[PDB]
Design a protein around this ligand. Structure first.
Ligand code: HEM
Length: 368
């Protein structure tokens, strides 16, 4: 459908772990990034790769794994050890298959949230639940980069949100069939699930320390759009002649908040303002099925107008409960950003303005 899973939502269910043997040379590099970056063999190993056709990647899962593999390699190749020694040309033997794969998957040829979070995970025991203790990531960049903590916690927020995402059909079916009580129950379940997601968000502190995130992991997630270190973007050698700019991987590429924004008729993409066009641009970095889901939601009849049109205090309360959960999420998120980015940096104003603009736009949608 829209590739939304009942259990893990926008996350990729049961991600593939191994590529065909044909790609062993890719997988070896991706699996040893900490060693290869530290020693400085990473770039040589990439430059020594044979050109591997993407023709042996024939299903969505192996394609997604391949994207994850090539994306991590590309971040490691471009940024190296992360202290200004960058590469402006991605060698053809990575760039061509990476760009061809990206075109088939309709994603930009850069590491994105849907790679390093949504597809970058495994259960330790398939017969145990989705808890941090029973989960791991598939790839990290450096020892101590907190990639396991940051990726898995993001993933757990996605999984928590899946419980709210799966009731969205009930919301639109209830409006259609004029089932006031069903609609009211649905909105209350969404708010309650979004509240649960806020509590999962607290696990960031349990598994990410700010020093490692800001000074290590953030480097490998950085992109080449408006980046002075790559002012023209990256050359994808043998695929496009001129360099192209793409933003880096970020939980800001998640579909979770945008999903409930559009659900509730919060028009975050309205206007020419910088917050709107950023959130619009981020959609290009989401899997196409999830882009299409967001667009289908915007085309559905408005939940907000339905609620505003019925003189029904219980419905307005349920709806506001959803808006307030979103506001609460964004408020907590501002704290996280302060802790993981603002303080480590000063030891910027645009970033906090952007986030406050989005929370305020959410807050304005309150009926009370
Ligand atoms: C250490 C933890 C985190 C940090 C430092 C962080 C950082 C940021 C930053 C810098 C932005 C601005 C947009 C950008 O530069 O890409 C952003 C926006 C955003 N982030 Fe986070 N993030 C963290 C965790 C999360 C998690 C776990 C989620 C959701 C699963 C998330 C969801 C979002 C969303 C949806 C936006 C878009 C703004 C909005 O809708 O309010 N973030 N984040």
């Amino acid at each position: 459908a829209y590739h939304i899973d009942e259990e893990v939502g926008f996350a990729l269910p049961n991600p593939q772990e191994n590529l065909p043997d044909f790609y062993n040379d890719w997988m070896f590099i991706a699996k040893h990034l900490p060693d290869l970056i530290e020693s400085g063999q990473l770039r040589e190993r990439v430059e020594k790769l044979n050109m591997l056709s993407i023709d042996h990647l024939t299903d969505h899962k192996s394609q997604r794994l391949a994207r994850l593999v090539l994306g991590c390699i590309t971040m490691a190749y471009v940024w190296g050890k992360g202290h200004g020694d960058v590469r402006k040309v991605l060698p053809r033997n990575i760039a061509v298959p990476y760009c061809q794969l990206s075109a088939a998957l309709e994603l930009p040829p850069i590491l994105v949230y849907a790679d390093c979070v949504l597809a970058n995970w495994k259960k330790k025991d398939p017969n145990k639940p989705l808890t941090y203790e029973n989960m791991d990531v598939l790839f990290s960049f450096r020892d101590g980069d907190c990639s396991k903590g940051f990726f898995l916690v993001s993933l757990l927020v996605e999984i928590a949100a899946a419980s709210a995402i799966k009731v969205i059909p009930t919301v639109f079916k209830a409006m259609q069939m004029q089932e006031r009580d069903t609609l009211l129950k649905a909105l209350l379940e969404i708010a309650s699930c979004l509240e649960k997601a806020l509590q999962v968000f607290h696990q960031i502190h349990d598994h990410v320390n700010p020093k490692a995130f800001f000074s290590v992991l953030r480097i490998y997630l950085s992109g080449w759009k408006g980046n002075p270190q790559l002012s023209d973007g990256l050359v994808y050698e043998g695929f496009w002649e001129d360099p192209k700019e793409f933003a880096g991987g970020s939980a800001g590429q998640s579909s979770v908040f945008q999903c409930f924004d559009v659900l509730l008729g919060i028009q975050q993409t309205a206007g020419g303002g910088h917050a709107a066009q950023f959130l619009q641009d981020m959609r290009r970095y989401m899997p196409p099925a999830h882009r299409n889901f967001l667009c289908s939601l915007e085309s559905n009849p408005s939940v907000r107008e339905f609620v505003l049109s019925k003189g029904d205090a219980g419905l307005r309360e349920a709806y506001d409960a959803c808006v307030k959960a979103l506001v609460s999420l964004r408020s907590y998120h501002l704290q996280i950003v302060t802790k993981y980015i603002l303080i480590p940096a000063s030891q910027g104003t645009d970033l906090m303005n952007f986030l406050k603009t989005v929370r305020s736009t959410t807050e304005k949608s309150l009926l009370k």
